[PDB]
Amino acid sequence: FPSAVTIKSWVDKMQEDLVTLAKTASGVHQLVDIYEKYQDLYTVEPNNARQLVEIAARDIEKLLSNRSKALVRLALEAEKVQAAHQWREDFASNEVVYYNAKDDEPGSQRIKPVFIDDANFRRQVSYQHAAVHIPTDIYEGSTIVLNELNWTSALDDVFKKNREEDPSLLWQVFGSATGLARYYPASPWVDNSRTPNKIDLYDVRRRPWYIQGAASPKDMLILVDVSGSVSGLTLKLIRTSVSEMLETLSDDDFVNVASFNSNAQDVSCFQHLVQANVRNKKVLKDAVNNITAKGITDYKKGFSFAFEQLLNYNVSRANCNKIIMLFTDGGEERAQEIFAKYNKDKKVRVFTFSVGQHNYDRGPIQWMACENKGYYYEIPSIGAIRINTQEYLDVLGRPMVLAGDKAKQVQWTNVYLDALELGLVITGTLPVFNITGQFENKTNLKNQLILGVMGVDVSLEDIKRLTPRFTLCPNGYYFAIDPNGYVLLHPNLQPKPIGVGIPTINSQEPVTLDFLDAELENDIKVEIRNKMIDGESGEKTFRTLVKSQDERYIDKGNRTYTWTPVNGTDYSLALVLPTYSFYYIKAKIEETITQARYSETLKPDNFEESGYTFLAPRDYCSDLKPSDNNTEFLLNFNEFIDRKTPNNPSCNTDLINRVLLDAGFTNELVQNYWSKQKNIKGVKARFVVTDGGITRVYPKEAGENWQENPETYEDSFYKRSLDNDNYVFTAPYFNKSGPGAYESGIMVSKAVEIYIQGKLLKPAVVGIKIDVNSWIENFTKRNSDVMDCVILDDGGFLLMANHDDYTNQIGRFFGEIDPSLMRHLVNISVYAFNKSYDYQSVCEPGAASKQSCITEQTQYFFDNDSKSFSGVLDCGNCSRIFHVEKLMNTNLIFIMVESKGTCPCDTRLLIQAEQTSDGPDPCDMVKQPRYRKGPDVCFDNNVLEDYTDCGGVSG
Ligand SMILES: *[C@@H]1O[C@H](CO)[C@@H](O)[C@H](O)[C@H]1NC(C)=O
Ligand SMILES: *[C@@H]1O[C@H](CO)[C@@H](O)[C@H](O)[C@H]1NC(C)=O
Ligand SMILES: NCC1(CC(=O)O)CCCCC1
Ligand SMILES: [Ca+2]
Ligand code: NA
């Protein structure tokens, strides 16, 4: 084995050759000189984080206030119209005229719309009437529905006025308590190719934006009868009913499921109330779908357990509605002592359900439902499950109605996918009360229930339009959260459902992504989250690990967080801004000739002498649309520049001027430096990616192999080389599909830095692609049999070797071609690994299309800053020798080891690719939960409530 001095000399020579080639071919110094030469076509402007955060929060507050005004006006008009309405049953003679969706009878006339095409809504809509959706099980000929249409036909004028006030208005909707939902503008309902599995089961009374406004958060505890007398069809009905009941809960509600058969016990691992999010609800459903019926019944022990679990106060709760929902069939036990012991003051409601078809006594069940301020329900078949499990929100809404005026508060819901194919939206909510005979105080019996719920939608793209990012760098961004910790805005939130567990095969759920799951978790992150949840203002500068856009690299970077609360609402907004992005360049190019030249630069027929130009698809104009092809997008851009005046009445001037300035600088670089040395031996392509959104590859034929995102803010190598302070080598993918490795080369990148007035700016990155053949020629200058020589980057991705068998698989993770060496050096502190979870992932349904899944990812990086390593790879029965050695000014390492053949010891390979996992364990996250702050306004237990109408004594 050669000594360490010769190894150091070899590594020094290789580093010198590689770094010299990259530096001379790229042109970092030339680009920096070109940037600094003018200093008169642009101006440096600061990015004051606090002012930007305050302005964005103010804009968001103003938008939400506008939506709240619209909701209040709609609710007032609806209440006033419903108050003065005459009941009638003569709909045969006089008909109600309305347009119905999901179509194509006496008393109803239908309307044929025009359905023009609109750009905001991604479908065809009409602005002359409001569509009406009536669920399948609701017959549109009944007198209740006819009266509903008759008195709701007055909302169209206020809808039109609302849309005239703010043309950017999205869907407006009134969901009635009778089942029908009237929305504006008119548009046909949804259908998917009329497949047999495309039945419309939509019911507005079950939508979360309706439930969150129909009542207040609760502390439900589902008590399930699992005695022997319930086995059969009724047990299956009970399981389905419990699942449907759990489907009505949200994040603000807390729930647990218990069972009793001569003994009361929990149904799962929780043992107490849990926040009832997607994971906990999935656990509860899976636990309740595995219960068996046996033993005698004992209501006293079960109710004692249910009351005991509601008096904990040692855990996180809601303290707003303690309700016990019993699911049973029948019995003869009333258990007066338990109710007189645990609630003399009727502080806990008891709802009772009799499930199945049987001949058991239902008297004591109704007595339990009527004594406590509860209700009694019957579920004899699967058909009644949908309706007879969402009716408890009428009982829970009586105190809110009795409170009345002080309960008219606009609430905003979670982020969810619109059912009419609009993306990610949030819905405002305001209930409407029934005030007929209010000035005479006559009935006050049917006035304890709400007419319905009104809603208005705001798209997340409207939120993103209020937080511009192109004055920042590719590493700075906004993000906002709600007091539950979930994310309202983030670059890592995608229009996909949240995955739960491993998908096993034989828009209903919300998109709830926590802040600590959209990024890498850290103690400072936890402190910042807890501090901004409580509506504080702060700023914190620290150092943290950042994952690359392509989930294979992790780099250490300095970050700064600045968070303020959004006034009026309950959201908090932050702004992550790296230290080198406190200043930006604005273009002061106000002159015809220079702009004309910089625009002529982009002509597609100049690519011979200007490289293969790309262009980021940005909103440069209102009339310009991102074409997603970039071959005609640049043509449209050139046409607009050629014909439209540079005044830009409807277009940003800053973005256009920035693009022109970057085009001029990049063309100067290409024409003055790259074009001189046309052919370089080891270089296959020379590229440059700028901040304004222009990327260039000099050999026009090399552009066809440039498979990079035209949006320079989405290029992983751009961000990676901005974070690092040296040359960055990017490893090609293993095989995928398409040219690579030998065809393309190896990408080396370096960011340019300028000090124009003592201020650090990084406005571009450049680099080259290296031919594999010449690199191998200079590496051997072997296919040996007793010595292995490999080169890896920070990440363990093989870039070159000497066996000519490793070099065929270039870019593959080194832990799959030589497991023992990688495992050994992963604990010599030369490599460190981070494991994280991704929830918005799709996996092939395994051997239990695609389904949502959770994928665990692992990334590797250099742990200890030591330039040399040594030791012996004693695997047992042999002893290999290795001299791992890093390279300077580069993220590469050089390894020389004994051949694998000499040691028969074979170990298991370790994989860096994502693994379809099922964790983390939910039974542990509830013992030490995160920090949350629930709502304070709670409406319950009003003494004027009648509650004389239970479900038993009336029949
Ligand atoms: C709210 O509405 C008013 C009137 O249309 C408008 O001036 C204001 O700009 C709107 N809010 C925002 C954030 O645009
Ligand atoms: C509002 O209350 C009155 C009086 O009890 C009742 O007749 C009417 O049906 C209620 N409104 C609706 C839409 O049910
Ligand atoms: N946002 C509410 C919708 C879909 C939903 O209920 O999620 C129904 C009414 C009209 C707009 C769409
Ligand atoms: Ca029983
Ligand atoms: Na909320």
PDB file of C-alpha atoms in Angstrom, residues 201-416:
ATOM      1  CA  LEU A 201     -72.816  11.555  -3.344  1.00  0.00           C
ATOM      2  CA  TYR A 202     -72.013  15.210  -2.640  1.00  0.00           C
ATOM      3  CA  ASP A 203     -73.948  16.619   0.324  1.00  0.00           C
ATOM      4  CA  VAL A 204     -73.377  20.246   1.309  1.00  0.00           C
ATOM      5  CA  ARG A 205     -74.391  19.517   4.905  1.00  0.00           C
ATOM      6  CA  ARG A 206     -71.282  17.337   5.391  1.00  0.00           C
ATOM      7  CA  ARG A 207     -68.678  19.684   3.903  1.00  0.00           C
ATOM      8  CA  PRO A 208     -66.164  20.939   6.505  1.00  0.00           C
ATOM      9  CA  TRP A 209     -66.820  24.599   5.662  1.00  0.00           C
ATOM     10  CA  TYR A 210     -70.446  23.923   6.662  1.00  0.00           C
ATOM     11  CA  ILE A 211     -69.739  21.929   9.834  1.00  0.00           C
ATOM     12  CA  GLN A 212     -67.235  24.480  11.151  1.00  0.00           C
ATOM     13  CA  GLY A 213     -69.925  27.168  10.993  1.00  0.00           C
ATOM     14  CA  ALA A 214     -72.870  25.041  12.074  1.00  0.00           C
ATOM     15  CA  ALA A 215     -71.499  24.599  15.621  1.00  0.00           C
ATOM     16  CA  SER A 216     -68.454  24.968  17.890  1.00  0.00           C
ATOM     17  CA  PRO A 217     -65.607  22.512  18.601  1.00  0.00           C
ATOM     18  CA  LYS A 218     -66.520  19.517  20.733  1.00  0.00           C
ATOM     19  CA  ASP A 219     -65.015  16.859  23.013  1.00  0.00           C
ATOM     20  CA  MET A 220     -66.875  13.879  21.578  1.00  0.00           C
ATOM     21  CA  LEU A 221     -66.335  10.440  23.124  1.00  0.00           C
ATOM     22  CA  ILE A 222     -67.889   7.632  21.082  1.00  0.00           C
ATOM     23  CA  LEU A 223     -69.158   4.797  23.299  1.00  0.00           C
ATOM     24  CA  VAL A 224     -69.753   1.589  21.340  1.00  0.00           C
ATOM     25  CA  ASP A 225     -71.763  -1.443  22.447  1.00  0.00           C
ATOM     26  CA  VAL A 226     -69.789  -4.598  21.641  1.00  0.00           C
ATOM     27  CA  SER A 227     -71.828  -7.062  23.683  1.00  0.00           C
ATOM     28  CA  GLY A 228     -72.697 -10.462  22.253  1.00  0.00           C
ATOM     29  CA  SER A 229     -76.255  -9.462  21.355  1.00  0.00           C
ATOM     30  CA  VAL A 230     -74.897  -7.062  18.657  1.00  0.00           C
ATOM     31  CA  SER A 231     -73.039  -9.571  16.464  1.00  0.00           C
ATOM     32  CA  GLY A 232     -74.202  -9.818  12.854  1.00  0.00           C
ATOM     33  CA  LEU A 233     -75.492  -7.134  10.500  1.00  0.00           C
ATOM     34  CA  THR A 234     -75.910  -4.637  13.339  1.00  0.00           C
ATOM     35  CA  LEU A 235     -72.212  -4.807  14.280  1.00  0.00           C
ATOM     36  CA  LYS A 236     -71.237  -3.988  10.688  1.00  0.00           C
ATOM     37  CA  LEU A 237     -73.746  -1.128  10.713  1.00  0.00           C
ATOM     38  CA  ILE A 238     -72.221   0.113  13.981  1.00  0.00           C
ATOM     39  CA  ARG A 239     -68.711   0.041  12.510  1.00  0.00           C
ATOM     40  CA  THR A 240     -69.826   1.935   9.404  1.00  0.00           C
ATOM     41  CA  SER A 241     -71.756   4.471  11.500  1.00  0.00           C
ATOM     42  CA  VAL A 242     -68.729   5.060  13.732  1.00  0.00           C
ATOM     43  CA  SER A 243     -66.549   5.632  10.666  1.00  0.00           C
ATOM     44  CA  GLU A 244     -69.065   8.098   9.201  1.00  0.00           C
ATOM     45  CA  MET A 245     -69.333   9.876  12.563  1.00  0.00           C
ATOM     46  CA  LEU A 246     -65.544  10.205  12.739  1.00  0.00           C
ATOM     47  CA  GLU A 247     -65.623  11.629   9.208  1.00  0.00           C
ATOM     48  CA  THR A 248     -67.492  14.698  10.523  1.00  0.00           C
ATOM     49  CA  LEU A 249     -64.756  15.761  12.969  1.00  0.00           C
ATOM     50  CA  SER A 250     -61.958  18.257  12.318  1.00  0.00           C
ATOM     51  CA  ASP A 251     -58.645  19.317  13.848  1.00  0.00           C
ATOM     52  CA  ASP A 252     -60.233  21.546  16.508  1.00  0.00           C
ATOM     53  CA  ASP A 253     -62.296  18.625  17.848  1.00  0.00           C
ATOM     54  CA  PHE A 254     -61.025  15.932  20.210  1.00  0.00           C
ATOM     55  CA  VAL A 255     -62.294  12.357  20.175  1.00  0.00           C
ATOM     56  CA  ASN A 256     -61.686   8.910  21.625  1.00  0.00           C
ATOM     57  CA  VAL A 257     -63.487   5.603  21.103  1.00  0.00           C
ATOM     58  CA  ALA A 258     -64.325   3.171  23.908  1.00  0.00           C
ATOM     59  CA  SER A 259     -66.216  -0.113  24.122  1.00  0.00           C
ATOM     60  CA  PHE A 260     -67.967  -2.069  26.848  1.00  0.00           C
ATOM     61  CA  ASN A 261     -69.160  -5.634  27.422  1.00  0.00           C
ATOM     62  CA  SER A 262     -69.318  -6.206  31.201  1.00  0.00           C
ATOM     63  CA  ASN A 263     -66.079  -4.175  31.117  1.00  0.00           C
ATOM     64  CA  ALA A 264     -65.241  -0.797  29.566  1.00  0.00           C
ATOM     65  CA  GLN A 265     -61.941  -0.285  27.764  1.00  0.00           C
ATOM     66  CA  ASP A 266     -60.359   1.827  25.059  1.00  0.00           C
ATOM     67  CA  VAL A 267     -60.504   0.584  21.472  1.00  0.00           C
ATOM     68  CA  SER A 268     -56.973   1.695  20.534  1.00  0.00           C
ATOM     69  CA  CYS A 269     -53.600   2.780  21.953  1.00  0.00           C
ATOM     70  CA  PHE A 270     -54.578   6.372  22.774  1.00  0.00           C
ATOM     71  CA  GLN A 271     -56.201   5.950  26.241  1.00  0.00           C
ATOM     72  CA  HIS A 272     -57.355   9.601  26.215  1.00  0.00           C
ATOM     73  CA  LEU A 273     -58.629  12.352  23.936  1.00  0.00           C
ATOM     74  CA  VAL A 274     -56.595  13.095  20.806  1.00  0.00           C
ATOM     75  CA  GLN A 275     -56.600  15.989  18.361  1.00  0.00           C
ATOM     76  CA  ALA A 276     -58.523  13.907  15.768  1.00  0.00           C
ATOM     77  CA  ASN A 277     -56.425  14.703  12.711  1.00  0.00           C
ATOM     78  CA  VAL A 278     -55.980  12.443   9.680  1.00  0.00           C
ATOM     79  CA  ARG A 279     -53.500  10.056  11.331  1.00  0.00           C
ATOM     80  CA  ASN A 280     -55.429   9.716  14.602  1.00  0.00           C
ATOM     81  CA  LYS A 281     -58.737   9.270  12.774  1.00  0.00           C
ATOM     82  CA  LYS A 282     -57.158   6.593  10.572  1.00  0.00           C
ATOM     83  CA  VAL A 283     -55.880   4.802  13.685  1.00  0.00           C
ATOM     84  CA  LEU A 284     -59.324   4.987  15.299  1.00  0.00           C
ATOM     85  CA  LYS A 285     -61.033   3.670  12.156  1.00  0.00           C
ATOM     86  CA  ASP A 286     -58.580   0.776  11.844  1.00  0.00           C
ATOM     87  CA  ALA A 287     -59.060  -0.058  15.528  1.00  0.00           C
ATOM     88  CA  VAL A 288     -62.863   0.074  15.327  1.00  0.00           C
ATOM     89  CA  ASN A 289     -62.901  -2.103  12.183  1.00  0.00           C
ATOM     90  CA  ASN A 290     -61.363  -4.963  14.222  1.00  0.00           C
ATOM     91  CA  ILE A 291     -63.785  -5.358  17.147  1.00  0.00           C
ATOM     92  CA  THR A 292     -65.789  -8.476  17.982  1.00  0.00           C
ATOM     93  CA  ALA A 293     -69.054  -8.919  19.877  1.00  0.00           C
ATOM     94  CA  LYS A 294     -69.116 -11.096  23.002  1.00  0.00           C
ATOM     95  CA  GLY A 295     -70.220 -11.007  26.632  1.00  0.00           C
ATOM     96  CA  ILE A 296     -73.066  -9.399  28.565  1.00  0.00           C
ATOM     97  CA  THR A 297     -73.960  -5.695  28.511  1.00  0.00           C
ATOM     98  CA  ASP A 298     -73.251  -3.253  31.346  1.00  0.00           C
ATOM     99  CA  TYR A 299     -74.228   0.377  30.756  1.00  0.00           C
ATOM    100  CA  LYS A 300     -73.168   1.581  34.213  1.00  0.00           C
ATOM    101  CA  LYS A 301     -69.477   0.730  33.815  1.00  0.00           C
ATOM    102  CA  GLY A 302     -69.426   2.069  30.260  1.00  0.00           C
ATOM    103  CA  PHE A 303     -70.968   5.397  31.239  1.00  0.00           C
ATOM    104  CA  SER A 304     -68.650   5.662  34.243  1.00  0.00           C
ATOM    105  CA  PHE A 305     -65.689   5.174  31.895  1.00  0.00           C
ATOM    106  CA  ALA A 306     -67.076   7.752  29.456  1.00  0.00           C
ATOM    107  CA  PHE A 307     -67.592  10.356  32.188  1.00  0.00           C
ATOM    108  CA  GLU A 308     -64.172   9.661  33.722  1.00  0.00           C
ATOM    109  CA  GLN A 309     -62.397  10.157  30.395  1.00  0.00           C
ATOM    110  CA  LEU A 310     -64.107  13.567  30.072  1.00  0.00           C
ATOM    111  CA  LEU A 311     -62.737  14.824  33.420  1.00  0.00           C
ATOM    112  CA  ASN A 312     -59.028  14.469  32.673  1.00  0.00           C
ATOM    113  CA  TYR A 313     -57.794  18.051  32.098  1.00  0.00           C
ATOM    114  CA  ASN A 314     -54.236  16.681  32.240  1.00  0.00           C
ATOM    115  CA  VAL A 315     -54.049  16.600  28.423  1.00  0.00           C
ATOM    116  CA  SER A 316     -54.829  18.963  25.558  1.00  0.00           C
ATOM    117  CA  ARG A 317     -58.571  19.419  25.060  1.00  0.00           C
ATOM    118  CA  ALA A 318     -61.150  21.879  23.734  1.00  0.00           C
ATOM    119  CA  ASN A 319     -63.422  22.419  26.783  1.00  0.00           C
ATOM    120  CA  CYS A 320     -66.327  23.478  24.621  1.00  0.00           C
ATOM    121  CA  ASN A 321     -68.775  20.590  24.067  1.00  0.00           C
ATOM    122  CA  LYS A 322     -68.544  17.429  26.174  1.00  0.00           C
ATOM    123  CA  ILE A 323     -70.857  14.954  24.430  1.00  0.00           C
ATOM    124  CA  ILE A 324     -71.270  11.181  24.739  1.00  0.00           C
ATOM    125  CA  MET A 325     -72.505   9.428  21.591  1.00  0.00           C
ATOM    126  CA  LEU A 326     -73.789   5.959  22.476  1.00  0.00           C
ATOM    127  CA  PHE A 327     -74.217   3.365  19.708  1.00  0.00           C
ATOM    128  CA  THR A 328     -76.346   0.409  20.780  1.00  0.00           C
ATOM    129  CA  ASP A 329     -79.497  -1.542  19.916  1.00  0.00           C
ATOM    130  CA  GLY A 330     -81.691  -1.653  23.019  1.00  0.00           C
ATOM    131  CA  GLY A 331     -81.976  -2.606  26.647  1.00  0.00           C
ATOM    132  CA  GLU A 332     -83.902  -2.268  29.890  1.00  0.00           C
ATOM    133  CA  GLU A 333     -81.333  -0.380  32.008  1.00  0.00           C
ATOM    134  CA  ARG A 334     -81.673   3.356  32.647  1.00  0.00           C
ATOM    135  CA  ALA A 335     -78.796   3.800  35.143  1.00  0.00           C
ATOM    136  CA  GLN A 336     -80.144   6.844  36.957  1.00  0.00           C
ATOM    137  CA  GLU A 337     -77.406   6.710  39.607  1.00  0.00           C
ATOM    138  CA  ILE A 338     -74.572   7.240  37.117  1.00  0.00           C
ATOM    139  CA  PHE A 339     -76.232  10.300  35.566  1.00  0.00           C
ATOM    140  CA  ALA A 340     -77.146  11.719  38.976  1.00  0.00           C
ATOM    141  CA  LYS A 341     -73.538  11.147  40.078  1.00  0.00           C
ATOM    142  CA  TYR A 342     -71.518  12.501  37.141  1.00  0.00           C
ATOM    143  CA  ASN A 343     -73.775  15.294  35.834  1.00  0.00           C
ATOM    144  CA  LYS A 344     -76.421  16.825  38.080  1.00  0.00           C
ATOM    145  CA  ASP A 345     -76.100  20.149  36.230  1.00  0.00           C
ATOM    146  CA  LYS A 346     -76.487  18.649  32.721  1.00  0.00           C
ATOM    147  CA  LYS A 347     -73.033  19.804  31.620  1.00  0.00           C
ATOM    148  CA  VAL A 348     -72.585  16.789  29.298  1.00  0.00           C
ATOM    149  CA  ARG A 349     -74.950  16.018  26.429  1.00  0.00           C
ATOM    150  CA  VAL A 350     -75.848  12.405  25.665  1.00  0.00           C
ATOM    151  CA  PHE A 351     -76.836  11.424  22.123  1.00  0.00           C
ATOM    152  CA  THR A 352     -78.138   7.899  21.594  1.00  0.00           C
ATOM    153  CA  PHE A 353     -78.299   5.728  18.476  1.00  0.00           C
ATOM    154  CA  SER A 354     -80.298   2.523  18.025  1.00  0.00           C
ATOM    155  CA  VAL A 355     -78.749   0.599  15.140  1.00  0.00           C
ATOM    156  CA  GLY A 356     -80.145  -2.320  13.165  1.00  0.00           C
ATOM    157  CA  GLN A 357     -83.457  -4.140  12.975  1.00  0.00           C
ATOM    158  CA  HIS A 358     -84.348  -5.873  16.238  1.00  0.00           C
ATOM    159  CA  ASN A 359     -87.120  -6.297  18.810  1.00  0.00           C
ATOM    160  CA  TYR A 360     -85.390  -4.918  21.912  1.00  0.00           C
ATOM    161  CA  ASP A 361     -86.839  -2.245  24.172  1.00  0.00           C
ATOM    162  CA  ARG A 362     -85.958   1.317  23.148  1.00  0.00           C
ATOM    163  CA  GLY A 363     -87.456   3.115  26.157  1.00  0.00           C
ATOM    164  CA  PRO A 364     -84.447   3.645  28.433  1.00  0.00           C
ATOM    165  CA  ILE A 365     -82.417   4.756  25.403  1.00  0.00           C
ATOM    166  CA  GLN A 366     -84.919   7.541  24.720  1.00  0.00           C
ATOM    167  CA  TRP A 367     -85.014   8.426  28.419  1.00  0.00           C
ATOM    168  CA  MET A 368     -81.226   8.819  28.370  1.00  0.00           C
ATOM    169  CA  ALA A 369     -81.526  10.984  25.259  1.00  0.00           C
ATOM    170  CA  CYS A 370     -84.237  13.213  26.764  1.00  0.00           C
ATOM    171  CA  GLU A 371     -83.063  13.636  30.376  1.00  0.00           C
ATOM    172  CA  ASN A 372     -79.683  14.952  29.280  1.00  0.00           C
ATOM    173  CA  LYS A 373     -79.882  17.712  26.669  1.00  0.00           C
ATOM    174  CA  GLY A 374     -79.368  15.231  23.856  1.00  0.00           C
ATOM    175  CA  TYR A 375     -81.209  13.401  21.088  1.00  0.00           C
ATOM    176  CA  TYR A 376     -82.251   9.929  19.962  1.00  0.00           C
ATOM    177  CA  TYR A 377     -81.697   8.451  16.500  1.00  0.00           C
ATOM    178  CA  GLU A 378     -82.505   5.229  14.657  1.00  0.00           C
ATOM    179  CA  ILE A 379     -80.284   3.726  11.958  1.00  0.00           C
ATOM    180  CA  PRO A 380     -81.965   0.602  10.512  1.00  0.00           C
ATOM    181  CA  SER A 381     -79.972   0.270   7.268  1.00  0.00           C
ATOM    182  CA  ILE A 382     -76.921   1.531   5.390  1.00  0.00           C
ATOM    183  CA  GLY A 383     -79.072   4.075   3.554  1.00  0.00           C
ATOM    184  CA  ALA A 384     -79.863   6.029   6.723  1.00  0.00           C
ATOM    185  CA  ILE A 385     -76.236   6.157   7.919  1.00  0.00           C
ATOM    186  CA  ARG A 386     -75.370   9.212   5.814  1.00  0.00           C
ATOM    187  CA  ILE A 387     -78.221  11.374   7.120  1.00  0.00           C
ATOM    188  CA  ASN A 388     -78.720  10.006  10.665  1.00  0.00           C
ATOM    189  CA  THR A 389     -75.107  10.703  11.702  1.00  0.00           C
ATOM    190  CA  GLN A 390     -74.793  14.399  10.743  1.00  0.00           C
ATOM    191  CA  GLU A 391     -77.948  15.589  12.538  1.00  0.00           C
ATOM    192  CA  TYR A 392     -76.369  16.169  15.960  1.00  0.00           C
ATOM    193  CA  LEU A 393     -75.133  19.566  14.724  1.00  0.00           C
ATOM    194  CA  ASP A 394     -78.704  20.879  14.966  1.00  0.00           C
ATOM    195  CA  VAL A 395     -78.796  20.230  18.718  1.00  0.00           C
ATOM    196  CA  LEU A 396     -75.310  21.679  19.278  1.00  0.00           C
ATOM    197  CA  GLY A 397     -76.298  24.897  17.481  1.00  0.00           C
ATOM    198  CA  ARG A 398     -79.096  25.995  19.822  1.00  0.00           C
ATOM    199  CA  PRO A 399     -76.865  28.024  22.212  1.00  0.00           C
ATOM    200  CA  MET A 400     -75.222  29.780  19.258  1.00  0.00           C
ATOM    201  CA  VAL A 401     -78.618  30.818  17.878  1.00  0.00           C
ATOM    202  CA  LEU A 402     -79.764  31.947  21.327  1.00  0.00           C
ATOM    203  CA  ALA A 403     -76.616  34.065  21.648  1.00  0.00           C
ATOM    204  CA  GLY A 404     -77.471  35.474  18.231  1.00  0.00           C
ATOM    205  CA  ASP A 405     -75.741  38.699  17.242  1.00  0.00           C
ATOM    206  CA  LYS A 406     -72.474  38.050  19.091  1.00  0.00           C
ATOM    207  CA  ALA A 407     -72.154  34.724  17.214  1.00  0.00           C
ATOM    208  CA  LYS A 408     -71.881  36.373  13.767  1.00  0.00           C
ATOM    209  CA  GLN A 409     -68.124  35.916  13.335  1.00  0.00           C
ATOM    210  CA  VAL A 410     -66.393  35.003  10.078  1.00  0.00           C
ATOM    211  CA  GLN A 411     -64.310  31.824  10.307  1.00  0.00           C
ATOM    212  CA  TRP A 412     -61.701  30.587   7.837  1.00  0.00           C
ATOM    213  CA  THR A 413     -61.166  26.867   7.325  1.00  0.00           C
ATOM    214  CA  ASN A 414     -58.245  24.598   6.455  1.00  0.00           C
ATOM    215  CA  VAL A 415     -56.635  24.289   3.027  1.00  0.00           C
ATOM    216  CA  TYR A 416     -58.520  21.795   0.869  1.00  0.00           C
TER     217      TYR A 416
END
